[PDB]
Write a protein that binds this DNA or RNA. Sequence first.
DNA 1: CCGACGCCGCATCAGC
DNA 2: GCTGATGCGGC
DNA 3: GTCGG
Length: 326
Amino acid sequence: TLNGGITDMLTELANFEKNVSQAIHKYNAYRKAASVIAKYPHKIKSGAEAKKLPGVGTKIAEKIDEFLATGKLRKLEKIRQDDTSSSINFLTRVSGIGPSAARKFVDEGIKTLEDLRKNEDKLNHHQRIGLKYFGDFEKRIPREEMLQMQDIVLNEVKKVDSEYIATVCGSFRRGAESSGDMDVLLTHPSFTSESTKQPKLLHQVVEQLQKVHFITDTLSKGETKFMGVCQLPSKNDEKEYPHRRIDIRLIPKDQYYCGVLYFTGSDIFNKNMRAHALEKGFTINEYTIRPLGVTGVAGEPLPVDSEKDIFDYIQWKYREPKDRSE
DNA sequence: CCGACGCCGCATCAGC
DNA sequence: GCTGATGCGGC
DNA sequence: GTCGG
Ligand SMILES: [Cl-]
Ligand SMILES: [Cl-]
Ligand SMILES: [Cl-]
Ligand SMILES: [Cl-]
Ligand SMILES: [Mg+2]
Ligand SMILES: [Mg+2]
Ligand SMILES: [Mg+2]
Ligand code: NA
Ligand code: NA
């Protein structure tokens, strides 16, 4: 947090461009800049020093100059005062309300939490669960609670079929002392890129976790991706734990390493790494790494037996999960 | 200057 | 019903 | 908004 003021500034600018301007590349530009500055191991003392980092250019350098000189940014101050922009920014904090729905709601005069509750019939299902648990979803999850949740998921998955392997990813696997949610990668030997030998592989797991009242709501659910809500059990007389977002991703067993690379993140690390892959002539998704031909079409999956193999292909030194928190 | 900016599952909608 | 585009959130 | 070519 050497430069927390600066990176906070860039994040709020990024959120503005995404939520209000719907300018996604500006959002990505600000987030890359914030990320490279949070990496930087000195207290930044000027915008020229910052412009030496990749992703910081002339515009951000000047903003950093204003911020260091005054402690504020007039642009953000103007944005914070505009009622319409502040309202759009707020509604996007509800899960399932993005920039488009937020501006549609505000255009219809729905601008506050109370407005949302009054108009819950204007929400799709995801948005309704996001409003229902609005306050809980803002809370972080201490790693100790993540540890308890991991124990439940892995033991309940083992009860369904001892051949499942569930791996907690996201920030948990990167070693964070708190997480925004719980990310679970699931494999089963009956589900490979070659064949799906058993139906209902994700559903069986989701159903078991609902059965024992760990999973409480569903935001979306398909054959390979579940997004919903869970809650640790509490003791007699004890306040309830907050409800938590849980994501479960069933990945073909022979594609585990690409999957766990993707699900470990961070999001900015994945963008950086996939971008670097393109410059080296490969393309990376959560299933495979493939070479790009001279015409730029993806060739056949390359063999992968470890996360490091993927690093090796694009000529990166290996980075432990704990060092992928960009 | 200028294109290119990571890649994708699910929910929802338009158009047929 | 399907297919294709769009919104959204995932890392 | 930034940047490589
Ligand atoms: Cl943009
Ligand atoms: Cl400010
Ligand atoms: Cl793999
Ligand atoms: Cl693929
Ligand atoms: Mg997470
Ligand atoms: Mg996240
Ligand atoms: Mg998640
Ligand atoms: Na720079
Ligand atoms: Na949202």
